[PDB]
Subunit: 332 residues, 4 copies
């Protein structure tokens, strides 16, 4: 229809559902989340501390949540291979659990009867696509794909614009990133990421990230030319990339602005935004762009050495791109 099902009803799953319910040609057929019951699901969907109450009627019955009359079947399988995606006629299963992110594990949705899978996270084996960057490379024989990460969606469109116009010799990126669900409210155990265990709302927390390197997977011409790191900070949503790049061709910051603005208003419209206003992170809450270039924050030291700044609602911008990729794959 395209008919979709959502696996995992966390931050991304619930917002992907909000957005999908608003797309006329997307039908949300079901959701699966083993960690929450049907009445609880309707509560989590209705109330949102970051993005406000759902603007629509939410209720539930025995086996569904109901949103403005649309019934969405719920399930609670830990193992997605046991889901009824075949008899529910699911075209695309959207996996937002962060747990079935490889070809051999996302394959479980296709085994369960879905025709294709979109993974809402970077993958080492599933081909990655970023709207505005390489979605045109998608072909219909690929049944399992990745939408990369929020940070890669922010960085890649900007990197493409800059590379096309001036050439990126190399670049180092920092993202100052809002806190996320993997973090802890007070110092607790996080054996895979020790800094990530520390009180989230009372610290600046360095973290490694593969997001800048992954740009090289969606733009092969930048393979090996980008890397970066992150600092997690106490804001609840919205993040910003700070990309320090060495350019091949001398340029002025004024020319950089005009090229980004022209791409924002042209071919990357709705993906890359542009502003000259005195913005701060909360001004992008609910913003559906992948990347909003902040022209006034950036700074140029020399004709080929510049620091560029771009904002992103890491929850809402990314969830919109997920639904965009779903619809692209369905029309292709």
């Amino acid at each position: 229809m395209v008919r979709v099902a959502i696996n995992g009803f966390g931050r991304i799953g619930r917002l992907v559902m909000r957005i999908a319910l608003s797309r006329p040609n997307v039908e949300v057929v079901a959701l699966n989340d083993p960690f929450i019951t049907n009445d609880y699901a309707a509560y989590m969907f209705k109330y949102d501390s970051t993005h406000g109450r759902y603007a629509g009627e939410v209720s539930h019955d025995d086996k569904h949540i109901i949103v403005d009359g649309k019934k969405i079947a719920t399930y609670q399988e830990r193992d997605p291979a046991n889901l009824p995606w075949g008899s529910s006629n699911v075209d695309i299963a959207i996996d937002s659990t962060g747990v079935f992110k490889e070809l051999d594990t996302a394959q479980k949705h296709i085994d369960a009867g879905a025709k294709k899978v979109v993974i809402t996270a970077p993958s080492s084996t599933a081909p990655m696509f970023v709207m505005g960057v390489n979605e045109e490379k998608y072909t219909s024989d690929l049944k399992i794909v990745s939408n990369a990460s929020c940070t890669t969606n922010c960085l890649a469109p900007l990197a493409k614009v800059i590379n096309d116009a001036f050439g990126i010799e190399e670049g180092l990126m920092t993202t100052v990133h809002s806190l996320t669900a993997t973090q802890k409210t007070v110092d607790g155990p996080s054996h895979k990421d020790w800094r990530g265990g520390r009180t989230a709302s009372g610290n600046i927390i360095p973290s490694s990230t593969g997001a800048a390197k992954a740009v090289g997977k969606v733009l092969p011409e930048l393979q090996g030319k980008l890397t970066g790191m992150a600092f997690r900070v106490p804001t609840v949503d919205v993040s910003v990339v700070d990309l320090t790049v060495k350019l091949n061709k001398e340029t002025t910051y004024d020319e950089i602005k005009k090229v980004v603005k022209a791409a924002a208003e042209g071919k990357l419209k709705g993906v890359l935004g542009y502003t000259e206003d005195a913005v701060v992170s909360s001004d992008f809450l609910g913003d559906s762009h992948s990347s909003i270039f902040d022209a006034s924050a950036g700074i140029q030291l020399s004709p080929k050495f510049v620091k560029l700044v771009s904002w992103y609602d890491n929850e809402y911008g990314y969830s919109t791109r997920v639904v965009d990729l779903v619809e692209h794959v369905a029309k292709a």
Copy 2:
């Protein structure tokens, strides 16, 4: 007294810090099946709320080491298997939250510990609050509970007020710092839906049995108190707001005089007293159970008054755990 700690969360770690500075307490062992020794040493050394441990912290294959004291570590999901017998543990301190009843805390005694202190309220293990009813501890009790941080804040003040003026009944609210059970962004919390909501961006109502539990350590107030909590985004330090109906007419100055005499007297180091313009961060690291805030309280009529008392919900309480350990060893 030789102790072992089960659980190495906020309470387990701070109890360890405090225990290492008490000359009559020897920390023999720590159990936490989550963490490895290197990570345990890290979690112990660095603390976002109470600062770096001021001593040398290291580790080896079988221990974490603090200023030369080797602390043996184990990783037993089931405390029954722990080497308490062969470690000559006198008291097992269980800070996991999981073995908080007589029949589960027994696993430490089966493992050879002589006694157990549970760092949480219990339905079945007798509760004690220092300055309130630790006198009632008798040496035949092998398993006991130190109640909760909120009960330790409310009970000493309630005793003082009840003994002097009579509490007919009272409704309490605690404005409480966020806790480890909360979530950084709205996530699943099936037993406490409000508690799943973004911790640092909400005021979050919660139920609490702390006021009711005062009735267990002060039987004369059974049925006379109840209350509720609001969890807010500060990282530590909480405050009780107790609204009481009194049996005897009083003035707020007489209330202040009585609480201060108690803080300076029999409840010294448990109940504190201030008239200064304090805010929550002024009690970070404070070892009192309850610090009465004289200037914040307000009396509407001779038998109806709102009393306010602060507590470092981590540090005050962890200090009382070690106090109760020593009392149970000297008794």
Copy 3:
């Protein structure tokens, strides 16, 4: 009704947003001697708490412009000089906090406005709270106050409870979001020492006259209520925790039934009612004065109960300012 706003802080700006969506209100003018027009347009368009204005905002040499409506701006430290007469202003809305008494608010009438609404409690100007005593407004009153956000939250609930069960007396606490008077890091606040302390890292006790002021809009409760506040790090939305002694024995279900009937009936849009597992962020942008939280409240005995009600201290109150403006114009 043609209105002018004095002051362009949190209340001034939100009153402007709400007023621009009321078809019977025309915003003629704004005064704030701090800001220039370009900056006024920016402060109006972007809002960290309530989002971007959903309309086009621009400015020129003498105006800020919102979806084609030109709003004349002035910069007069002394409202006496403002062109209210020659702007045919019916009601001057003073949100500065500075001209909150009869003899100072008079400056707007001297400048030619017909009437004034002061968006703060006043010692001398009569106070009105919608759903509580706006019926008592008489058209000869030129200068009136809309009380405070906390009074607007407490008074409608107190009226409902008092009318049904009788309030003998009550002590209130509000857990209140931080406000513009607070400081980002410990700094000078000579009139309110606790209020100078780092806003986002403390629970901060504060005094409030809001409960006492209920006695001004409901004379039958004069002397029967008082209370205090704790300011905490959330950016907006507050909650009242009202502990009342009742005249008539009741059950908590009868209390719920009465408040719900009122919320669905005569107090619709002023007092709301919920049983859901809400937290503060669920009322961001809510236009009610008071949302009774049925599941958070707790009854200890038949005449002693704790009632809980939420309020968006910016948005609910700004909505009531515009309601009172229109009521005073239709009266």
Copy 4:
């Protein structure tokens, strides 16, 4: 003695006083702050939301605050030229108001009878000094000096070490900075810095900063080679610099670490620190270093292009350097 007086009893003034009271050869003779009375001053000094209660007895009498027996005279002049610095025999007035930061205005303390002035902020006209970087350039004929800013104190010692060993061709810096007193608790007026007016604890807030350029004033060899920007975030204290540098000589990240560690343990001891642990910002609360290199957070993309990370308690590290500069100037 050296005898000092403090002008301005804000974050820096109060912490400079805590530290000075602990230095045996520094005598704190007086403080001036027109915006607060004597009993209030004693309260602000005793209680601190960030750095805890003063460990010592604090009281007051009519005209002094008293700390562990030491009486410190208080004053309330808006115009520092009216202070009794001559009859109080003040050797060094420390101006921490952020308001008397030029030669011609700091001069007021010398007119009032102080022999020298140390300004606790960057200055356009007073010569700037950073301990560990160029304090040796101080000569006794200079009566009015600046200790630069906290960010410059963090960046300059690291920049010196890196430049000496590998040569800095150019560098772009970001500081992720804790909130400060100039910021607002909820959106309010800040006509000189519009982004700076926005709710401080609910936003990431870009800001311009001259701190990276100012490194060129204390290290002339780096004049024109550095610039940067800042993001203010909701933590209450402790900041971190993220310095992206182009090097003249190829190197490995491993060699960079060994050079920084050797400087931290040698000539820059107590100014530049070094760690390999999984630290987060709150681990540096109360830390007296200007700069603590975070070896595990940094990342190198190529042999001459690296991102380095260094922490600083912007309040406490800087206030310690103020007292250090005061004592250097007194012994010189």
